[PDB]
Structure 1
Amino acid sequence: MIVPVRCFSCGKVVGDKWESYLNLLQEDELDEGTALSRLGLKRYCCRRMILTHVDLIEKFLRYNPLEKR
């Protein structure tokens, strides 16, 4: 679903870094290792929270019962 607000192990706020992360991969064409280190994630517990997130909310939102089609 949506990005976790905090990291499970450390407790850093991580939820503000998911849209920043997808732009470092798309626009700047960084690899995942450089993109996580420019976001300021450097404990590997805090790295895997953004590195490994699936983001299924984009797949749930297509099933909207409140709008036509």
Structure 2
Amino acid sequence: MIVPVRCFSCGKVVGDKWESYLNLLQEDELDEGTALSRLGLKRYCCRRMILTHVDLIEKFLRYNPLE
């Protein structure tokens, strides 16, 4: 639903980077890991959740009560 605040192993703050990540993916066509490489994740455990975790919560907001 949301970027989890930390990965299930490292427990480095993940949440900050999801926004800026997606920014770096949309603008600035660039490779995934290479992004995260300079985005500050040098260890895969953390990295998965950036590579993973489809963002649902907006796909939910379609159904928001007020519409």
Using structure 2 for the length normalisation, give the TM-score. 0.91
Runs of 4+ in structure 1 over 6 Å off: none
Cα distance in structure 2, aligned partners of 1:5 and 1:11 = 8
Cα distance in structure 1, aligned partners of 2:42 and 2:27 = 22
Contact preservation (8 Å) 1:36, 1:51: no
Task: Note the residue ranges of structure 1 that are not aligned, 5 or more in a row.
Answer: none
Query: Offset at 1:16?
Result: 0.6
SS of the residue aligned with 1:12?
coil
Q: Deviations over 1:37-57 (max 9, x none)?
A: 111011110110111120100
Contact preservation (8 Å) 1:6, 1:13: yes
Cα distance in structure 2, aligned partners of 1:42 and 1:64 = 38
2:12 pairs with 1:12:
yes
Query: Offset at 1:66?
Result: 2.5
Query: Offset at 1:2?
Result: 0.8
Q: Aligned-residue CA RMSD in angstroms?
A: 1.0
Task: Note the residue ranges of structure 2 that are not aligned, 5 or more in a row.
Answer: none
Alignment coverage as a number of residue pairs:
67
Q: Which has the higher helix share?
A: 2
The structure that has the greater radius of gyration is: 1
Q: Percentage identity across aligned positions? A: 100
Q: Deviations over 1:24-43 (max 9, x none)?
A: 11111111011111110111
Using structure 1 for the length normalisation, give the TM-score. 0.89
